[PDB]
C-alpha cells in the first residue's frame, strides 16, 4: 500500500511539471504581446509531451574525458531528491516534517556540485561553486525562517512541532515581511529571476537533461506547497497555481542581479532580517 | 577635453565670425609660416566639415610627424584633440608608393585637417600611440591591409586577416580572390586551406569610353 | 518629353503641368506628445501594514490561549 | 526616477567615495537626505516593500489582459507593397514572345555577378538569347537588374516563399525564370500599373 | 507481421511528430541575415509557438541556423560547434552570404557557402530573407522530418 | 494613453496597389 | 603575494574575449576581432559608384540609409552635384526613422543582456512598423539602397506621411510603456549606475562619437555643428548627461529618440512638392517613360548603368552623425568610373578599442553590460 | 578503356571545381569505408552516385563531399529490386561494391549479400557496356573452406563476380582502423563496459591491420592503373601482429593499470555465444549487439589473417601503407584514456618561452 500510494503520488507530479513548464512559456507569451506554444497539438497542449519524446530518442553524448559514474549521478540524485521531498509532503506524519524537507533539500546542492566537477568545461566549474554559492547563502535565511514559523505550531495535547497537519487553516497575517522574504528565498533557491546568473549542465544531452529541468521545477513546486502551508493556511491546487503564476509574473517583469550583489543581499540584508525577526517572535511568544 | 554644454539656451549660430574666417581661409599660411620645417606641401581643397567651404591638407616627412601632430594637437589656434582614423592609399607607380593620411578635427572651433607622410615599403612610420590612443589599432589595420611598419608601437600584430594570413590584401598587386581557399576534408577530419579554384571566374567588364577626358 | 508625359489636352503653357505627389493635410498634421509623462504616501503604507500585523498578532494570541 | 542615491551604485570606487565623503550631495542628480519624520517613512517605503518593483508588475499584467499582435502564418500573412523585390522572373509580350532582347544590361549593372547571357540570332533574324541564368546564391536582390532593363523583361515578382532541399534547385536557368513568368505574369502587370506613375 | 508493421510506421508516425514540433536549434548571428531572425522570433511572428525554443548550448540543439556571412577564420569554430551536436541534427542555411558567398563570393576572406564546410538541409533564399520567408523554409524543414522513417527502415534490416 | 494595435480601416487603410488618387510625379523642371 | 593573473577565453559563439582577472577583479580586456572581415574596401575598387552603393546597406545592418548617406555626400562633393529640396527633406526624415530603429534594438539588445526580456518583444513590434515604411518606398525591409547620387531613388508613393502621422502619434506612449520596466528600477539602476565611466578627456583622446559623448557633458552634435541637407532648419534639443554612465547613456538614448520624433513630426508637415532627383542627366538616370521616348534619355540610360558617371580626380572625407557615432568615407579618386580607395571610419571600431580601460576594476557580470552600452555591430567594425 | 579512364576527361588542375572525367556508383557510400572511398572520389572532380537503404540523416555528411551536382543521391534502395541497381549504376564507368554484413537477421543472410546481389551486380553491370571497372571488396580471411561462415559466402561471391564480370577487381583488405571502424572501437567497448573480456585460446593468431585512408588511396591507384583489373589484392599494414599483441597496445594506450582479459578454449567461447546465435534470426537486428559474439569470430580467431606470400599488395600499387601502431592512426584511442588525453605539467619547456604566451596559459 505504501508503493502504491507513493506510484500515485508521482503520476500527478510529473504531468504537473509538464504542465508547468508549458504554462511557464505561455504565460510569459501573453505577458509579452504574444501567444506561445499553440501549434504542437490543440492549444499547444502536446508540447511537454513532444519535447519529452524528442530528447528520449536523442542520442546521448557521454564524453570521454570525465568520469562516468557521477556525471550519470548527478541529475539522477537532483531527480530522486525531488521526488522523496515530494512524499516527505504528502505520505508522512513525523514531528519534524519541516525540518526533514529542509534537510532534503539541503541535500539538493550536490547535484549542480557533481555536475561541476563530473564535466570537464573550464566554466562548468567556475559557475557550479556560483550556483552553489547563491543556493548555500539563501539556506540561512530559510532556516531561521523555520524557526519563526515553529514557535507557534502547536498540536492539540500541546507539544510542539512541525506536522504539516497541525499548521493553522487561516493566512499568518503577522508575518508578511518574513512571507516576502520566503518567496524571495525561493526565488534564489530555484535559480529563477533575479538570480539566474550562473550552466551547470552545458554537457548534459536527451534524459539527462530532461531530469535535471523535471528535478528543478518539482523542487519549485515543493517550495510553493511549503509556503502555501506555512504563510497561505494551507496546501491546495489554487495555491499552488497562483504562487507559480506569480514565479512567473516577476520572471517576466525584472532583470537579474549581479554575483556579489545578491550575496550582498543575502548575507546582509536577508539573514539579518529574519534573524532580527526571530528574536522579536520569541519575545512575543513568551 | 573640450566642448563641454555651457549655453542652456538653443543655439542657432556655428561658430564666431573671426575664428572661422581664420580656420576657413588663413589656417593654410597660418601652419606653413609658424612651423616651416613639418611642412614640405600644402593642399587646400573640398572641405571634410561641409560642402561650403574650404579646408587645408598638410605633407610632411615621417622624422617630423610627432612633432608637428603634437603641435596641431596642443597650440592654441588649432586645437585638433580627435584623431578620427589612420589610413593608407596605394600608389604603385610612384617611386614611395605608400600615402599614410591622418585625418582630424578640432571641436573648439568646428575644424578639420588633414595629414599625409609619404613612405615605401620598407620606410618605418613613427607611431603615434603616445599621441593619440586610438592610434593603436588604426596603425595594426594598416599594417594588416598594407604591410606600412609603424616603429616603437606596443603590440604591431594583424587584427583583421586571417590567423596564418601572409599578404596585405589591400595593395594594387594583390588579387582580388586572393590566392587559397577553404573547405572541410572528411578524409583528415579538419578545416583545410587548399589553392583557389573557382566553379565561375570573376568576368571584369573594361567599360571605359575612349572619348573621355576626365581620366588621370 | 515631359508635356508628353504630364501635359493635357489643350495646355497653353509648360507652367501649367500638373503636380500630384504625397503632401500633409490642409493645415498640417496635428501635434502630438513628444515628452515623457507620468505612489502613496509612506505613512499610509506602513499603517495599513501596522494595521494587518496586528490583526494578524492578536489572531495569534487568541488560537494561543484556546491551544 | 532617474534619481540616484549613495548605495545604489554598480561599482566600488564610487561606492568607497560616497560613504567616506559628502561630495555627492553637491550633485543635483542625487536624492536629498530625508529632513523629517515623514520624509523617512517615505524613503523606508522606497527601499524596504518595495514598491518600485510593482510598478512594472502592474504594467506587465496590464499587457496580460491586453491585446496580441500575432499573425497565424501560414493562414494570415503580412504587408507588403508593390515595389517588393522577391523572386526573379522572365516576361513576355501579350503575344507570347519574349520581351528580352540580348541587350546585356542587366548583366553589366549587378553587382554581384549573378547574371551569365549568351545570345546569337533567332532563325526569322530576332536578337535573343540562348542563355539566361541566375545565381540565386549569389544575387543580393538589390533590384539594379529591373532598373536597367529598358524593355520590362526581367522583374523581381511578388514571391518570397521559394525555399529548397538543394542548392542545384536554386540556379535558375532561362526556361524555370520564363516558367515563373508564366505563373505570376497578372500580379506582376497589377504591380506594374501602379509602379509606372512613379518610375 | 501486417500488425507489427502497422504498430512500427506508428512509432515514426509518432517520433516524427515529436522531433518536427520540437525543434531547438542553435544562432549563429554572424550578419545581416541574424536581426530578421530576432524579428521571427518576435511577437509578430513567434517562432515559439511552433515549438521551437532558441538554445545556448550544442548539446541540446537539434538545428543550425547559420544566418549570415561564413569567413575563413570563422569555418574552423563552426565546424567544431556542428561537430558538437547530437544526432540526429539538422542545418538550415539563410541568406545569400550562407547559401553561395552572396555578395562576398569574389573576396578573398569569404566561404563560398556553408555547403563547402557542412552539409544543409534546407537553403533559405533571399538577402536578408524575410522573417515570413524564414517561417516557410522552417515549416519545409519540418515537412521533410514528416517524411522519414526511421523505425521502418530499422525493422526491415 | 495612445494604444499600440489599431483597429480596421484606422491605418493602412488603403493598400499601396489600390492608392484612391493617381499619382502625377514630376521628373523634370519647366524651365 | 605574486599573484599572477588568471586568463579566460569569452566566447567564440561574433566577438572574441581574452579576459585577465585578479580573483573577481578585471585586469585586461583583448578582443579579437575579423571574424566578419568579408573584404568590402577591396572589393569596392573593382565596381562602379552605383555598384559599390549596397555594401554601405551591410556595414551597420541595424542603420541602413545612414551608412549609404556618407558615401553619396562624398561623391555629390567631388561630383558638384546639387540635392533638390524634397530629396534633402526626404533623406533628413528618413535618417530620423533610421536613428529610431537603432535606438530601439539597441536599449533593448542591452537590457535583454542585463536580463529584462520584455522590453525587447515590446520595441520589435514598433521596429516591424518602421520595416513596413522601408518596405513601401523601397521594397526591401532592410537593405533598401534608397539613397543615391543627387537625391533619392524613388519618390514616395501616396499614403504614406500620413501612416507615418498615425506611428508618430503613438510612439511617445510606447516610449513610456519602455521605462516604467526599466528607468525607476532598482536592479537595473545597480547594474547601470557608474559602470565604464568615460570623462570627456578620455572621449575625445579615444575618438568617441555619438551618445557616449554627449553623455560625459560635451555638447556635440553633427546634425548641429556641421549639418547636412535639411538639418539645419531642423528644430531639437541636444540631450546633455554628466556622469559618463551606462544609465546616463540610456537617458541619453532615450531622448534622442524623443528628438528623433520631434524631428519626424516636423518633416512630416514641411515636405514640400518637386523633384525629388537632380536634374543633371550626366549623373542621374533619366525617368523610364523619358527613356522609352528620347534619344538622348536613352542614351544616357545605356550608358549610366553600364560604365557609370566618370567623378573627377580628387579626395574627400564625409561623415554623418550615424545613430552609433561619427560614420564617415574616405574616397580618394583618380578620375575613373571606379573608386581608386574607399576608406571606410566606423565608431564601433572606435568604441571596442576602450573595452581595455573601461573595463579595469569591473566583474565578469559588466563586460556585457559595457558591450551592450557601446553600442557595436561587428560589419561595420570588420569591414 | 586502359588508362582513357583517368585521362580523357580530366579538365582542371584536380580540385574541388574541376572534372576528372569518373562517374562513379558506390553501393554502401553511408558505411565506414564507402565514405572514405566516396570523399577520395569527389575531391578530385568526379561525379560519385550513392544509393541508400537507410535514413537521409545518417547519408547527410556524403553531400558535403563534393561541389554542386556531383553528389547524386538515391534513398530507398532495394538490392533484391534490379530495377534500382540498373537506375543507380544508368550513366556509371566505375562501379565500386562495399555492401557487406557481419550478424545474420531475420530479413538478411549471408548469401543474399555476399553471393546473391554481388552476382546480379556483376551481371547488371556487365549489361551496360559503359562500365569500364567493377571494384569489389571482400575479407583477407575469405576462404570457401572457411568454418566462419561469412567468408565462405565472401569467398563464393568473389568466385561469382570473376566469372560474371572478368575484368572486375576483387580487394581483399586486412582489418581497417579508422575513427568509425569495427575493430578497435569493439576492442575498447571489450576492454572497458564488460566485467571479463575473453580472448580465444592463447591469441597468438596472426592479422595484418591497415588504415582506412590507405585503403582509399588503394581504391583511386587501382583506378589508374589498367593492369590491375581482373587481379585480387590483399590490402595490409607494415607491421604483423598478434591478438595478445593487439591487446597490450590497446591496455599500454589507455592507461588501464588492470588486466581484465581472461584466455579461455575455443569450446568455452562458443558456449558463451551460442544462446545468442540461435536466437539471431526471427528478430529484426538489435543495437550494440557486438560483431565478435558470434561463433564466426571464434572460426576466425583460430586461424591467421595475413597476406599470402607472392600476393600483390600495397607495393604493387606504389603505396607504402601506414603504421598502424603508433602516430595518427592511434590517436583516437588516445582520446579515451583514464581522465583525458592531456598535455602534461608543461613547464620544463616554457622556461624560454616569450612573455604573453605563458600568461595566456597560465603556466
Ligand atoms: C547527499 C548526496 C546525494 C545522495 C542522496 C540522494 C538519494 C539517493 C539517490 C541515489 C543516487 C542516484 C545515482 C546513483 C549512482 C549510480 C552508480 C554510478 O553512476 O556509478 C557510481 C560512480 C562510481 O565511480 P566511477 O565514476 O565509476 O569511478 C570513479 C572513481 O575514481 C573510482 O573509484 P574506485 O575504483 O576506487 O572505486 C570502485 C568502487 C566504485 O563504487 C561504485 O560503483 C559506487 C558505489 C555507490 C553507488 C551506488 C549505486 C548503485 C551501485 C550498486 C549498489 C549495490 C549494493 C547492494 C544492493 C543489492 C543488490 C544485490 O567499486 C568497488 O570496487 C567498491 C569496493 C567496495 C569497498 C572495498 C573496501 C572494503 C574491503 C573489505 C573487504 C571487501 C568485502 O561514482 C560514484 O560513486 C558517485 C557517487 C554518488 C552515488 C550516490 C551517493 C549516495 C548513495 C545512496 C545513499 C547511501 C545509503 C546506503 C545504501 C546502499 C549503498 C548505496
Ligand atoms: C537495494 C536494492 C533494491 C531493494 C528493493 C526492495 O527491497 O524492494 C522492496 C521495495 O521495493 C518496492 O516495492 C518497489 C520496487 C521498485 C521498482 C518499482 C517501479 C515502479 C512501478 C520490496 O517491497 P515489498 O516488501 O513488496 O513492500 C512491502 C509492503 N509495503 C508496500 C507496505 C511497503
Ligand atoms: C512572488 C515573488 C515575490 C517577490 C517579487 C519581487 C522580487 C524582488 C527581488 C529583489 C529584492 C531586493 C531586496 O530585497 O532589497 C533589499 C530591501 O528589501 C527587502 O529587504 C525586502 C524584504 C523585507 C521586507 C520588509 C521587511 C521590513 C518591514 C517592516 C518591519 C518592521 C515593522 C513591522 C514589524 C535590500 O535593498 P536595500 O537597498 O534596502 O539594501 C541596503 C543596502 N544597499
Ligand atoms: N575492417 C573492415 O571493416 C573490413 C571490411 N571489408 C569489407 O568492406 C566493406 C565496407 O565495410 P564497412 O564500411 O567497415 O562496414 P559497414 O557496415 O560500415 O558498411 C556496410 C554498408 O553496406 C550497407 N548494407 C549492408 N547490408 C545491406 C543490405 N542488405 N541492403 C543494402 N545495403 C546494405 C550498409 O548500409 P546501412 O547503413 O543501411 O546498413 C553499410 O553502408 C564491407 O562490405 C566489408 O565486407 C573487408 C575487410 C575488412
Ligand atoms: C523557458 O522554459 C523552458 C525551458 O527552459 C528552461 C525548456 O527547456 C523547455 C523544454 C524542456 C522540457 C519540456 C523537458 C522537461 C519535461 C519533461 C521531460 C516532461 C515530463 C513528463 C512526463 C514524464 C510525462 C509524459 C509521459 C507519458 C504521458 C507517458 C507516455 C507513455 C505511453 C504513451 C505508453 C520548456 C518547455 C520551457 O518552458
Ligand atoms: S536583383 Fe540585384 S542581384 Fe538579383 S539579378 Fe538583379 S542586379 Fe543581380
Ligand atoms: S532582361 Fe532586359 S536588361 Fe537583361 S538582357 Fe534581357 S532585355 Fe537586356
Ligand atoms: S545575405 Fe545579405 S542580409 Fe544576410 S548576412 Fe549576407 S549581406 Fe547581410
Partial sequence: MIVASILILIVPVLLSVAMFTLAERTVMASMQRRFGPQVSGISGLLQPFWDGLKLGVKEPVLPDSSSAGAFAASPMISFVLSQVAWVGICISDASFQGLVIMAISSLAVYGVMLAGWASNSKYAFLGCLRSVALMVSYELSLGAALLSIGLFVTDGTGMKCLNFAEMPTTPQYAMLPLCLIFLVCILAETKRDPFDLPGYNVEYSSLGFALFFIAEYANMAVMSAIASIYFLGGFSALKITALFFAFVWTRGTLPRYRYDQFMRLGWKAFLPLTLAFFALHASVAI | ?216 | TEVLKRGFPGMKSVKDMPIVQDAPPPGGFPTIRIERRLGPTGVAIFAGLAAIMGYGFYKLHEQRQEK | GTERRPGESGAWKQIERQRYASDWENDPTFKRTPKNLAEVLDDSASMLLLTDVWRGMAYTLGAFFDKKVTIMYPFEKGQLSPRFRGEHALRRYPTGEERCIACKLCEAICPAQAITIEAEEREDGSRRTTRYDIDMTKCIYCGFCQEACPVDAIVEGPNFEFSTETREELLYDKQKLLENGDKWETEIATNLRTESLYR | ?157 | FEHYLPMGLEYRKFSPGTQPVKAVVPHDSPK | ?383 | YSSTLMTADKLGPGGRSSVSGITATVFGANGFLGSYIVNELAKRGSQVVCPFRSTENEAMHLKQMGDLGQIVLLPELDIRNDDDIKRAISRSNVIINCVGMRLQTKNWSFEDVHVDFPKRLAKLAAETGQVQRLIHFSDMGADENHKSLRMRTKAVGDKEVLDAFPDATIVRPGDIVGIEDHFYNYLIYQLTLTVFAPVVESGSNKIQPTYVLDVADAVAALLRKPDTAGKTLYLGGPEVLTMREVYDLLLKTLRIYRDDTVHLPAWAVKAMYKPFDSVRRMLPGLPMTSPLATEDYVEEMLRDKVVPAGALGYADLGIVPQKVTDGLAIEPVRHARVGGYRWGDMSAVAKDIPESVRKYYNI
Avoid at chain 7, 190 to 209: K, L, N, P
Wanted: proline content about 5%; charged content about 25%; some cysteine.
Fill in chain 5, 1 to 157: 507481421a501486417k500488425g507489427l508493421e502497422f504498430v512500427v510506421s506508428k512509432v515514426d508516425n509518432v517520433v516524427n511528430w515529436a522531433r518536427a514540433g520540437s525543434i531547438w536549434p542553435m544562432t549563429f548571428g554572424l550578419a545581416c541575415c541574424a536581426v530578421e531572425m530576432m524579428h521571427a522570433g518576435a511577437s509578430r511572428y513567434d517562432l515559439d509557438r511552433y515549438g521551437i525554443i532558441f538554445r545556448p548550448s550544442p548539446r541540446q540543439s537539434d538545428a543550425m541556423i547559420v544566418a549570415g556571412t561564413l569567413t575563413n577564420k570563422m569555418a574552423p569554430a563552426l565546424r567544431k560547434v556542428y561537430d558538437q551536436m547530437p544526432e540526429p541534427k539538422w542545418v538550415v542555411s539563410m541568406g545569400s552570404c550562407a547559401n553561395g558567398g552572396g555578395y562576398y563570393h569574389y573576396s578573398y576572406a569569404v566561404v563560398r557557402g556553408c555547403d563547402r564546410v557542412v552539409p544543409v538541409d534546407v537553403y533559405v533564399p533571399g538577402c536578408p530573407p524575410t522573417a515570413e520567408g524564414l517561417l516557410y523554409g522552417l515549416l519545409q524543414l519540418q515537412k521533410k522530418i514528416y517524411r522519414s522513417k526511421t523505425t521502418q527502415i530499422w525493422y526491415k534490416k
Fill in chain 7, 1 to 383: 603575494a605574486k599573484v599572477n593573473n588568471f586568463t579566460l577565453n569569452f566566447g567564440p559563439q561574433v566577438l572574441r574575449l581574452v579576459l585577465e582577472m585578479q580573483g573577481e577583479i578585471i585586469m585586461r580586456a583583448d578582443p579579437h576581432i575579423g571574424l566578419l572581415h568579408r573584404g568590402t574596401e577591396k572589393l569596392l575598387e573593382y565596381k562602379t559608384y552605383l555598384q559599390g552603393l549596397p555594401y554601405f546597406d551591410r556595414l551597420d545592418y541595424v542603420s541602413m540609409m545612414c551608412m549609404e548617406h556618407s558615401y553619396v555626400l562624398a561623391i555629390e562633393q567631388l561630383l558638384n552635384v546639387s540635392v533638390p529640396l524634397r530629396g534633402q527633406y526626404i533623406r533628413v526624415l528618413f535618417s530620423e526613422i533610421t536613428r529610431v530603429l537603432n535606438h530601439l534594438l539597441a536599449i533593448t539588445c542591452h537590457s535583454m543582456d542585463v536580463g529584462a526580456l520584455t522590453p525587447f518583444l515590446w520595441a520589435f513590434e514598433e521596429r516591424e512598423k518602421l520595416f513596413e515604411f522601408y518596405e513601401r518606398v523601397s521594397g526591401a525591409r532592410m537593405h533598401a539602397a534608397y539613397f543615391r547620387v543627387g537625391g533619392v531613388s524613388q519618390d514616395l508613393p501616396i499614403g504614406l506621411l500620413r501612416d507615418v502621422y498615425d506611428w508618430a502619434r503613438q510612439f511617445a506612449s510606447r516610449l513610456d510603456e519602455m521605462e516604467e520596466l526599466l528607468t525607476g528600477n532598482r536592479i537595473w539602476k545597480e547594474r547601470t549606475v557608474d559602470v565604464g565611466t568615460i570623462t570627456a578627456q578620455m572621449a575625445w583622446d579615444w575618438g568617441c562619437s555619438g551618445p557616449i559623448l554627449r553623455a560625459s557633458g560635451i555638447d556635440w552634435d553633427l546634425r548641429k555643428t556641421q549639418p547636412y541637407d535639411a538639418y539645419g532648419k531642423m528644430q531639437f534639443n541636444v540631450p546633455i548627461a554628466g556622469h559618463g554612465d551606462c544609465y546616463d547613456r540610456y537617458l541619453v538614448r532615450l531622448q534622442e529618440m524623443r528628438e528623433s520624433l520631434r524631428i519626424i513630426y516636423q518633416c512630416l508637415n514641411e515636405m514640400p512638392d518637386g523633384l525629388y532627383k537632380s536634374p543633371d542627366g550626366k549623373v542621374c538616370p533619366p525617368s523610364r517613360s523619358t527613356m522609352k521616348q528620347s534619344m538622348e534619355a536613352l542614351i544616357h540610360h545605356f550608358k549610366l548603368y553600364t560604365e557609370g558617371f566618370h567623378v573627377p580626380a580628387g579626395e574627400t572625407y564625409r561623415a554623418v552623425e550615424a545613430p552609433k557615432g561619427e560614420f564617415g568615407v574616405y574616397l580618394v579618386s583618380r578620375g575613373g568610373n571606379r573608386p581608386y580607395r574607399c576608406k571606410i571610419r566606423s565608431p564601433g571600431y572606435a568604441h571596442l578599442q576602450m573595452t581595455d580601460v573601461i573595463s579595469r576594476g569591473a566583474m565578469l557580470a559588466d563586460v556585457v553590460t559595457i558591450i551592450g552600452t557601446l553600442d557595436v555591430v561587428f560589419g561595420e567594425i570588420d569591414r
Fill in chain 2, 1 to 216: 577635453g573640450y566642448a563641454y554644454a555651457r549655453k542652456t539656451t538653443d543655439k542657432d549660430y556655428i561658430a564666431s565670425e573671426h575664428m572661422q574666417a581664420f580656420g576657413n581661409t588663413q589656417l593654410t599660411d597660418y601652419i606653413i609660416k609658424t612651423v616651416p620645417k613639418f611642412v614640405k606641401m600644402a593642399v587646400t581643397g573640398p572641405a571634410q566639415s561641409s560642402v561650403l567651404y574650404q579646408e587645408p591638407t598638410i605633407y610632411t616627412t615621417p622624422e617630423s610627424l610627432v612633432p608637428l601632430m603634437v603641435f596641431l594637437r596642443d597650440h592654441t589656434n588649432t586645437q585638433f584633440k580627435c584623431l578620427l582614423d589612420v589610413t593608407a592609399v596605394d600608389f604603385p607607380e610612384r617611386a614611395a608608393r605608400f600615402e599614410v593620411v591622418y585625418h582630424l578635427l578640432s571641436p573648439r572651433w568646428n575644424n578639420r585637417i588633414r595629414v599625409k607622410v609619404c613612405v615605401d615599403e620598407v620606410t618605418a612610420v613613427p607611431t603615434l600611440c603616445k599621441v593619440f590612443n586610438t592610434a593603436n589599432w588604426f596603425e595594426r589595420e594598416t599594417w594588416d591591409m598594407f604591410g606600412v611598419f609603424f616603429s616603437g608601437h606596443p603590440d604591431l600584430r594583424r587584427i583583421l586577416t586571417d590567423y596564418g594570413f601572409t599578404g596585405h590584401p589591400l595593395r594594387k598587386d594583390f588579387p582580388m580572390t586572393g590566392y587559397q581557399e577553404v573547405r572541410y576534408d572528411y578524409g583528415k577530419k579538419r578545416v583545410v586551406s587548399e589553392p583557389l579554384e573557382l566553379t565561375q571566374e570573376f568576368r571584369y567588364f573594361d567599360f571605359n569610353s575612349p572619348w573621355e577626358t576626365l581620366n588621370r
